[PDB]
Amino acid sequence: SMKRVQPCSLDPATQKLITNIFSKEMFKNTMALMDLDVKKMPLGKLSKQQIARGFEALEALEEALKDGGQSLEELSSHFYTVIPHNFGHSQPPPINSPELLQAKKDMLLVLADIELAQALQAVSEQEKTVEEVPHPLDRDYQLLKCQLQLLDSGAPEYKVIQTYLEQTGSNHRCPTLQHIWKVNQEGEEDRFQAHSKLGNRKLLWHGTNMAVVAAILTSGLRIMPHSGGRVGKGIYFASENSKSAGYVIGMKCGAHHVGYMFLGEVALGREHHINTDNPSLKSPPPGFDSVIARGHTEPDPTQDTELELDGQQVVVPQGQPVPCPEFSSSTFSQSEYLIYQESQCRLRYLLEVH
Numbered sequence: 001s002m003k004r005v006q007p008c009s010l011d012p013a014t015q016k017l018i019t020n021i022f023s024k025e026m027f028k029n030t031m032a033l034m035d036l037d038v039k040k041m042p043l044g045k046l047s048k049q050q051i052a053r054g055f056e057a058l059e060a061l062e063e064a065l066k067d068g069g070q071s072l073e074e075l076s077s078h079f080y081t082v083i084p085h086n087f088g089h090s091q092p093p094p095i096n097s098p099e100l101l102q103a104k105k106d107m108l109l110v111l112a113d114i115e116l117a118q119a120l121q122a123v124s125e126q127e128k129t130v131e132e133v134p135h136p137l138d139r140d141y142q143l144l145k146c147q148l149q150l151l152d153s154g155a156p157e158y159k160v161i162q163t164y165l166e167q168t169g170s171n172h173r174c175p176t177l178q179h180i181w182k183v184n185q186e187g188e189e190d191r192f193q194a195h196s197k198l199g200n201r202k203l204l205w206h207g208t209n210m211a212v213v214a215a216i217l218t219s220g221l222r223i224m225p226h227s228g229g230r231v232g233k234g235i236y237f238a239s240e241n242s243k244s245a246g247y248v249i250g251m252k253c254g255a256h257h258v259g260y261m262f263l264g265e266v267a268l269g270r271e272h273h274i275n276t277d278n279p280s281l282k283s284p285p286p287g288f289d290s291v292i293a294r295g296h297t298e299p300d301p302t303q304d305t306e307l308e309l310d311g312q313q314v315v316v317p318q319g320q321p322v323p324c325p326e327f328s329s330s331t332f333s334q335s336e337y338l339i340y341q342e343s344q345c346r347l348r349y350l351l352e353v354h
């Protein structure tokens with residue numbers, strides 16, 4: 001009656017990643033870092049319904065912020081009832097600016113991915129009936145339905161990636177490369193095949209929270225109804241690692257600070273360049289396939305190389321950032337690359353950095 005636990009098939013680096021991205025402590029840390037009350041909102045109690053209600057609560061606040069309706073205090077108080085927060089048992093603050101509204105929308109987006117990782121781990125029926133089970137880390141890896149292949153130092157893309165990291169990361173304290181995995185999330189293949197005629201492909205950084213990595217591996221980079229930011233409702237990338245790194249929180253592990261960053265192949269097609277913030281965008285202007293909020297600098301284009309991925313040439317920057325005189329007055333210090341359809345990105349690499 002005792003089930004056999006089969007030996008783990010994963011290399012140590014992958015075991016570590018799979019431990020990290022499903023870690024209950026990591027998820028709870030992330031909740032504490034977003035001011036959530038983890039005692040009142042434990043991981044096993046998070047539900048899709050709760051999250052839905054929280055978004056409805058924010059929708060009502062958004063309406064008030066743009067009549068005799070409920071005050072921002074009352075409507076905040078509703079939100080906090082739905083999504084418990086911890087501010088050392090003082091009374092949480094009213095959501096009364098566009099900036100704070102987007103911060104709460106972004107918190108719930110993170111929480112939605114935490115809930116997905118929990119839902120994903122639910123033990124199925126066939127699992128209750130089989131007499132042998134995979135090692136927990138094999139099981140968790142398999143749940144992702146995503147192939148990860150750890151690269152070594154002499155993989156053809158390895159030096160190119162390392163160069164992109166080193167040349168466009170922070171000058172004074174560049175993240176240290178630990179591992180690179182090739183990511184093959186199948187069922188990304190077909191939608192991305194759609195844009196095969198679209199030239200102008202670029203390999204671009206997307207940094208995130210450790211708490212959303214499992215979700216990204218299962219489903220790709222996604223746009224939600226409440227997605228937002230300086231260039232509107234799309235998926236954000238950067239050509240400078242240092243820009244994307246600003247979005248990595250990174251978890252203390254022993255004496256190290258561990259973080260994860262993706263590289264996506266983005267079919268940018270015909271680019272629309274802007275130089276001022278537009279949080280209201282929901283697509284490129286007619287006739288364009290992307291929006292690039294152009295920064296004061298860009299990785300030196302004269303140093304761009306290419307990789308061949310699924311038979312397509314994909315541009316990879318290799319240059320240190322240089323000034324772009326035409327965009328010296330831009331509201332953006334560094335470029336943000338936007339797509340507004342999920343099919344225009346395919347995940348290609350995952351990097352662990354310390």
Ligand SMILES: C[C@H](NC(=O)CCc1nc2ccccc2c(=O)[nH]1)c1ccc(-n2ccnc2)cc1
Nearest residue numbers: 106109110205206207208222236237238244247
């Ligand atoms: C709030 C979080 N957003 C991010 O992780 C954005 C990270 C990021 N932002 C950038 C902005 C400008 C330039 C670069 C970056 C970047 O590299 N990463 C998030 C957004 C959407 C979702 N999501 C999607 C579907 N369900 C939840 C989950 C988490």
